[PDB]
Amino acid sequence: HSIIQFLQRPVLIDNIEIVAGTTADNNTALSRYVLDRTNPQKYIKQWTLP
Amino acid sequence: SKPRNQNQVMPLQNVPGWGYSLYKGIDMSVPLAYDPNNELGDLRDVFPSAVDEMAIGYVCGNPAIKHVLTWSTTDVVQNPISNGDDWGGVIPVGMPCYSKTIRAVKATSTKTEVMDPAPCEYVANLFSYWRATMCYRITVVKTAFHTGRLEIFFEPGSIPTVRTADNLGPDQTQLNGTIAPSDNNYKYILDLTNDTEVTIKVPYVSNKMFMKTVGIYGAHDEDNWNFDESFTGFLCIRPITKLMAPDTVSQKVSIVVWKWAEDVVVVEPKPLTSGPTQVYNPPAVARDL
Amino acid sequence: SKPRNQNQVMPLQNVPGWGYSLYKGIDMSVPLAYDPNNELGDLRDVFPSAVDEMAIGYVCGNPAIKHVLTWSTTDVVQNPISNGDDWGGVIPVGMPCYSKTIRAVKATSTKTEVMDPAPCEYVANLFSYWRATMCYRITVVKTAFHTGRLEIFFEPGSIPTVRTADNLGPDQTQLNGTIAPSDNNYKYILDLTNDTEVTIKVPYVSNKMFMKTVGIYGAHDEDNWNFDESFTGFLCIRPITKLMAPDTVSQKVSIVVWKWAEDVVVVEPKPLTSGPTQVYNPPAVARDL
Amino acid sequence: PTSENPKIGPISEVASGVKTAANGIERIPVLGEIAKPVTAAVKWFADIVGGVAAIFGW
Amino acid sequence: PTSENPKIGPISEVASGVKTAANGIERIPVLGEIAKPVTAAVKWFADIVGGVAAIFGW
Amino acid sequence: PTSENPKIGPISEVASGVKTAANGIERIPVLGEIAKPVTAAVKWFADIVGGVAAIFGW
Amino acid sequence: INLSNKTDENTISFFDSGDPERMNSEALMRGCGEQIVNLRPLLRTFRTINDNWSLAANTKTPITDLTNTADAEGRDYMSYLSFLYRFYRGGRRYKFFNTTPLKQSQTCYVRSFLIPRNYTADEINTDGPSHITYPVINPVHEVEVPFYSQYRKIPIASTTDKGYDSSLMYYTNVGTQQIVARAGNDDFTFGWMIGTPQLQGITKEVAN
């Protein structure tokens, strides 16, 4: 296997477990408006690439 | 060797910057370059995509979510689903925006209105009049054990509104099956037994060749004409059959609605707004202005 | 006999000197001559050479000596030869200049920095960005009784530097075979048994289409980014085998390095420098300014 | 094109090579909107590779 | 047309397709006074349907 | 050369007669960069040897 | 019935209407006179970013001091549309219409130079190509900036590098006030299409 092929290998990065009725950022729904930076859109996970 | 002039006297006009607002013409801009014929190459291997992302059909063809409603087992039949989001059940058909929130901060209380536009609305805000075929993808977030019948019908003309001092909203009392029968309205009855989705294209119909791009901008109890004149009508989403769900699943489902436009036409390159195009930059905290 | 005008009203702009900074165009300069079609002939039998000495490939193709190093029998292996000249062993790969001396004269002490440019560097100083294939001729001044092995390897990216208040220089401690192995670097191992010379062309490689022509101009501990961004990398000349020499010859040799450029491209006709292009006119004595 | 001005337009129109309603939702290849590759189609590049006397200062 | 000005008129004359004394009382079809239908006869429409490179900004 | 200006360039381009990459290191004969020998190729010299009426003041 | 949650891709249109392009073209022929099908032409148009930009005499001003705000505002098309994209390329054009209400000197002249983006005037020479106008005979200073770049594309975000693309430096021997309009050259455009930001509408003060 070349280096390219080695880099085309799927890698497990994260593993998330969302639970209902948690009211956490993982289950907080996308908001209609964003009026302040203190009330941003909440995300489950974030990944800086590459 | 030095003959005489035989040309006539040219009439002229010292009008610099003639047609600078047009897109076509020969520009008198001096290039701070070496070659007057300076010109970049074509766009091969510049952007990640060789597609033209600047065409109106590619921008207004990018859908965005505008409605996420909550259809509970209590929702009455032939009543618009008004739980979960603003403008509940009603969908003003048009490229302009219909929804806005008011940020009120402080003596006094300064109020600025914010919009949540899809790319079609972002584009329409740049012009005075529009004309397009509006396309809506109505998806239901459910399981294989939720069943129900959903009625999506188109009503032309103005919308029943509960007009406020700073905003407009639909009057859900004038949209019940008693006051607003769907028997003489184009509609699509959707079964949720197994399917979840229907895309609905609404062609352009109006007594005008072009509608306005104002929408909800400055719309309230006193300023309400342009809003009504900015849309061809509205869709209403009402249950034909109550939501059916055992106690092993959720007693509610979420109705997601994507919005985009096709066969688009924009008329005037000037907005119809009181003020200019301005982007809302959310401040750091809720105290700022 | 005297008909009427049928021409339209020309729109105009009183913009004298339009495009005078360009090289191509029709000049409105009035000739203090007899003939408007005054024009000299071609260049046959004017200059000693019918060659075009004004082409960038003929100027940047004129090599010049930039390094004269002293390789003693004490020089350690896999250590850059840093004796004899500045920027010892290290060769920043690029058309700009990398070496400068400070003339400090006087109360106060006025400091002006002087450069030692080859024709390629002289040309590059006239532009903002460059791109070229850099060619180096590495000659060794020795006899038939000196032997040794010389390693010339290319390292891309910024250079290890000992930054001063007025200049920059290489850190010879971060270029030893321990910290800087040449095992994964393009290189050429040269035997000195009989040969003395190898010409090395370094194509252009970088994450930029064009590098900067600033170089060492104003480069010091505080201003150091543009210098690093003005070169594609650097060569390092390290002994693979200690210098071998009997006591009948010199215990040292001189390593002469010529520099020129090929496949040259210059981008902007404006320098990137704080100030203009200025030629250093050496004063009569060391007291002048 | 019926125009009472002898100069029908400000500029000389260049053909594209596009087979799509420009205001439609279907993709448009941006390379078919104009031909400006690395060829004599570009003015200065044609000047260079054709060796005109102006690139030398004559 | 005998004119001592090389430019006989300010504009380029366009033909109509009319068979009537213009100052007469008989009706004149206003569509035969000029041809400007939805065709390449109109400049911008020809620009669009011919896919010129200017409608894209090139 | 694709140009939306009818005047593609400010000047009329003159051919050289050069077989070299102009930015290359190989020599370029400066006489092949333009043809301006002692011939009718030069305007005033052609005026003289062709005996035009302007060199006499007419 | 079979237990499943699926998607059949059902699509419906609500009217037996004629071809939309027919109707659209008729409506344009009758009420617009033109057809906008792309948004680059709007970058070829000139639009105002400031009606009053005051300058101090004998001062080399980089136009970044103005564009760095005129881009976040969203008033012009080069700014409004930038909020939809992440890249851009190509050069730019600026026009300066004189609005000076006083005579400062017997000879007022305006001059424009090049400069790397995000630089200061004390960081660059005044050599290179230039354009000079005299507002009294020509009150419109039109200039174009090419795409002199180390990169084939330029992002609309902050970078570690500086001076990787060209900009404009503006000079005047007197205090001038100007209307500034900008636009893109025949080669400017944007890149990725991304989502929209939120828009600002009418503002009101209320003495609650």
**Cβ atoms of residues C149 and C192 within 8 Å:** yes
Encoded tokens for G87:
């890249």
Residue C63: how many CB atoms within 10 A of its CB?
Answer: 18
How far is Cα B163 from Cα C226, in angstroms, rounded to an integer?
A: 61
Does residue B41 sit at the D interface (CB-CB below 8 Å)? yes
Q: What length is written for chain F? A: 58
State the smallest CA–CA distance between residue D37 and chain G in angstroms: 13
Chains that touch D (3 or more CB pairs under 8 A): B, C, E, F, G
Nearest CA in chain C to E9: C6
Residue located via tokens 């024709």: C119
CB of E31 within 8 Å of a chain D CB? The answer is no
Do the beta carbons of residue C87 and residue C169 sit within 8 Å?
yes
Closest CA to C61 of C226, C255, C258, C230: C258
Q: Coil, strand or helix: which one is D52?
A: strand
Q: Cβ B55–D28 below 8 Å, yes or no?
A: yes
Cα C194-C197-C203 angle, rounded to 5 deg: 145
> What is the count of structural domains for chain G?
1
Unique residue bearing structure tokens 């900036």: G145
Cβ neighbours, 10 Å, residue G200: 20
- E contacts of C7 (beta carbons < 8 Å): 7, 10
Burial class (CB in 10 A: 0-12, 13-18, 19+), C237: buried
Residue C274: how many other CB atoms lie within 10 Å: 14
What is the amino acid identity at position G86? R
**Token digits of residue B123:** 């584009």
DSSP A32: S
- Resolution limit, Å: 2.9
Give C202: exposed, middle or buried? Use CB within 10 Å, 0-12, 13-18, 19+. buried
**Sign (positive/negative) of CA torsion B159, B161, B164, B169?**
negative
Given CB atoms, is F6 within the 8 Å cutoff of chain B?
no
The alpha carbon of residue E12 is apart from the nearest alpha carbon of chain C, in Å, by 12
Neighbours of chain A (3+ CB pairs under 8 A): B
- What backbone torsions phi and psi does residue C42 show, to the nearest 5 degrees? -75, 175
Residues of F with Cβ-Cβ distance to C26 under 8 angstroms: 10-11
Q: Which residues of G touch C211 (CB under 8 A)?
A: 150
Q: Which domain holds residue G150?
A: 1-208
Give the SS3 label for residue D40: coil
Q: What residues pair up with B138 in beta bridges, in sequence order? A: B198, B257
The answer to whether G183 and G44 are in contact (CB under 8 A) is: yes
Cα-Cα-Cα-Cα torsion B68, B72, B75, B81, nearest 10 degrees, comes to: 0
Q: Which residue of C has its CA nearest to E7?
A: C6
DSSP B79-138: S---SSSSS-SEEEESSS---EEEEEE---EEEEEEE---HHHHHHTTSSEEEEEEEEEE
**Among candidate residues C49, C56, C17, C37, the one with its CA nearest the CA of residue C262:** C56
Q: Is D21 exposed, middle or buried (0-12, 13-18, 19+ CB in 10 A)?
A: middle
D44–B contact, CB cutoff 8 A: yes
**Size of chain G in residues:** 208
Under 8 Å CB-to-CB from B90, ≥6 apart: which residues? B80, B159, B170, B175, B234, B235, B236
Q: Inspect the interface and report whether the beta carbons of B1 and F5 lie closer than 8 Å.
A: no
Q: What is the dihedral of CA B244, B246, B250, B255, to 10 degrees?
A: -20
Q: What CA–CA distance (Å, rounded) separates C42 from F38?
A: 9
Separation CA C138–CA C63 (nearest Å): 12
**Nearest Cα to Cα of residue D56 among C270, C58, F38, C277:** C58
Question: How many other C-beta atoms are found inside a 10 Å radius of the C-beta of residue B136?
Answer: 20
Of B24, B52, B54, the CB nearest to E54: B24
Q: Exposed (0-12), middle (13-18) or buried (19+): which is B73, by Cβ within 10 Å?
A: middle
Solved how?
A: cryo-EM
Q: Which 3-state string (H, E, C) describes E1-58?
A: CCCCCCCCCCCCCCCCCCCCCCCCCCCCCCCCCCCCCCCCCCHHHHHHHCCECCCCCC
SS3 call for B198: strand
